[PDB]
Amino acid sequence: DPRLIWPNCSSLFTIPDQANCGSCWAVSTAAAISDRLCIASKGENQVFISSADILSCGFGCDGGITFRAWEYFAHFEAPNCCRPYYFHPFAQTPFCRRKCRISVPAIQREIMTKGSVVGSYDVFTDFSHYKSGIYRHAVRIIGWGKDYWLIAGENGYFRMIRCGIEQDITAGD
Amino acid sequence: YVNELLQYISERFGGIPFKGGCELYREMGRIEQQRALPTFMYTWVNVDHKNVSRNSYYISQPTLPMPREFYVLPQFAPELDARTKAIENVMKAFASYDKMIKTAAREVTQIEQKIAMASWPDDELRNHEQQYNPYELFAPSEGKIRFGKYIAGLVSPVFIGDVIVTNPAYMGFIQMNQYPFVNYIIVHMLFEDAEHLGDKYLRIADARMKCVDTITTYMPYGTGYVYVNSREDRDQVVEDVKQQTELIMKTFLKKMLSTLSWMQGESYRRAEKKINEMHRNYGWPKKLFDDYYSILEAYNNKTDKSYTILNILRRGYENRESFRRKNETADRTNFLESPASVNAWYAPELNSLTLPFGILTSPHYDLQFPKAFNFAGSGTVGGHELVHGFDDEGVQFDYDGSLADCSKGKNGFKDMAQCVVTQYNAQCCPACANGAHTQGENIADLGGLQASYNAYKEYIKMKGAEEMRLPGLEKFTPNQIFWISYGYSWCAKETQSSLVKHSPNSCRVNQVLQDIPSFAKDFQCALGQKMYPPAEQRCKVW
Amino acid sequence: DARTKAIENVMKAFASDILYDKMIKTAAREVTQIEQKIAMASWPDDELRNHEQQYNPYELNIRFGKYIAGLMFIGDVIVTNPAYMGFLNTLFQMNQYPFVNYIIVHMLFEDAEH
């Protein structure tokens, strides 16, 4: 678990903020980018970044591309952050607005070195039927346990055994 | 009690010199709720016009900085240059390129025109019956290109609740044209927040006076409560003015069908009743005097001397207060404005007659003064306003607040008004003041005063003793001094620049004095004189 | 309302020919308040002097159909009332019924004596 590894930061412990949106992968990519950025000084600079802003800045709520989101680099209506989500937790797509408003073995190895990352999948209805435990037949991975991988439903978390769940990740910076 | 902070505010868009297509409103809504700075909409929010049990939005055209749509008839616009200079901040703000700045100044005008030529000049803005257009984001989305995304600028909302685009004239609308907006908008924001800027630009504009007044329209009830529950015995003046007004309103009712001409039987009975079911309010709200509960009304307003942030905050409140009012239920004891402005008001949207303690005072009034006065002052203004609820505006809203065209009689009414029209139209003050425009308030000039006289008559006759000429001067009459006092209220040396920049006073006195021949007589002076006309003696509209 | 009365009376005198004796008494109010909209957005006169203004050009605002065909790479059609020629755009399959309702009654009203 990365929460026990680094308790300083409080980014991992989060959920989504978009009742009717199709940018789940984008929101997960922004959350995973903040988790990988926390490894820099072990969470010393544990701050959030425009997630929803950068997402819009697929067709927003009609497909996704984690890889593209990572290459693009180079909370629910929170006043703390400069830019926040646009979905008052059957919706419209938002435009750009840069105006601060006030190999499973190699995968686990890279996940233990860098940190959490995005995890593309088919996203079937079976997953929704699941509640807790080693569930089986987009989201981001957290860590591993006993063998299965963690993801974030079951109070945010939703672990699965190790439909292209471990298939679709790369890196960049 | 410089620029950087609000600079970030400005840099919340991008500025003039040298982008994906922004929801100009979102910018607006922000700027409104954060500064109370109306552009692309003045939007006051309250009681529905014609289904009232509720509240609503009145999204509407702005009210232009340059007073009057004067974006049509003479080219007397140097705001061009009250603009360049008052926008020269930048190359003193953060820069070092004028040609831009100029052309863009001309432009922030040229749009302005392209607005005024699409609002409704007041003449058309009588018959609210056609203002009223209930729409909900469903229908605008069908009507236009953003409303929804706007309204977040203004606490679970009532987006669905009946909103009204009073003026469904929105002229429907690019690089060199889009950002002209953001210019204009920012032109404006800074244009009336230069104060917080460095002491330099404030130039382009008494200490306690200006200050307390800013308050006097911002945290209204505060200063009110201070005044009232500070300096006088509420019970006393309130209990007087109760019966005083009541006298007026009464005899005013007596000015009814029985009195009146252009009216008719049932039109009477109704409008009569409109009075009958109509409300008072004096000084304090019904609240304001377990003495905190006012400090509940104005509760939220954080206090921290621990001014830039201050003002901005306080405006944030004044309006935020205005709108937390939105989603609760509609009353009919609305206190429009801060009970220290010396004027009544009567919001025919709902129906109400509130008068401010701040008027329960000098020349408008006093406790132990001759009654000629306490009818010419508090008395007058009482009536002076009350009239409205029979103007060609009052007719619209019923007794209870709705649209049923209360009264045919109309034709009579308008025709008779045309007398008033010409009257003001042929007697110039300066060297004019065309009448057709100000008709309405002009009529009330008469109505109120007419009543307040007829009352004072009645009252004094009931005793028959007050006459008792005045010590400072025997010469005058227990009666004349009435007119003298009324026409003393408006004693106002309007300096002449201000005169050329309601109606102009000297007119109001002279004219509306003509038309009450009762005067012409009771002031001893021969008739055939340029205060009193012959047989068409008086545009007897009351 | 005189305009009203006359409108309904035109389409009435029309109703002589059959080649529903009340609904006219609605179509009337329709086209009337249509007048009212047109006017209440159109431009009154005096303000028709800023030739400076009424010149903004447009070539090839939204709701348009060729419609030039119905008159007979064109130059820039110039539109003398951004205000007006917008206001049509906010005023547009049901529409056809009361909107064509108007153009008839108008065209009719043209040559009554004939």
Numbering used by the authors:
A (entry chain G): 9 to 65, 70 to 86, 95 to 109, 125 to 137, 159 to 193, 203 to 211, 216 to 221, 229 to 238, ...
B (entry chain B): 176, 186 to 202, 208 to 285, 294 to 342, 352 to 360, 370 to 388, 398 to 429, 461 to 544, ...
C (entry chain A): 270 to 288, 294 to 334, 350 to 361, 374 to 393, 399 to 420
From the primary publication:
Once docked, models were refined with molecular dynamics flexible fitting (MDFF). Both aspartyl proteases (PEP1 and PEP2) fit well within the arch, which is not sufficiently bulky to accommodate any of the metalloproteases. The PEP1 model was docked into the map as the model for PEP2 was almost identical. Since the MEP models were all similar in tertiary structure, four copies of MEP3 were docked into the central base. A single CP was accommodated with reasonable agreement into the wing. The proposed active sites of PEP1 protrude into the central cavity of the complex whose dimensions are large enough to accommodate hemoglobin (Hb) or albumin. The channels through the centre of the base would allow for fragments of Hb to enter the active sites of the MEPs and exit through the bottom of the base. The architecture accommodates a sequential digestion pathway, facilitating positioning of products from initial digestion for subsequent digestion by the next enzyme in the pathway.
A major Barbervax component is H-gal-GP (Haemonchus galactose containing glycoprotein complex), which is highly protective in sheep vaccine trials. H-gal-GP is located in the luminal brush border of the nematode gut and digests ovine hemoglobin and albumin, major components of the Haemonchus blood meal. A combination of SDS-PAGE, N-terminal sequencing and cDNA library screening, have shown that H-gal-GP is composed primarily of families of two aspartyl proteases (PEPs 1 or 2), four metalloproteases (MEPs 1, 2, 3 or 4) and several cysteine proteinases (CPs). H-gal-GP is a multi-enzyme protease complex that digests the Haemonchus blood meal.
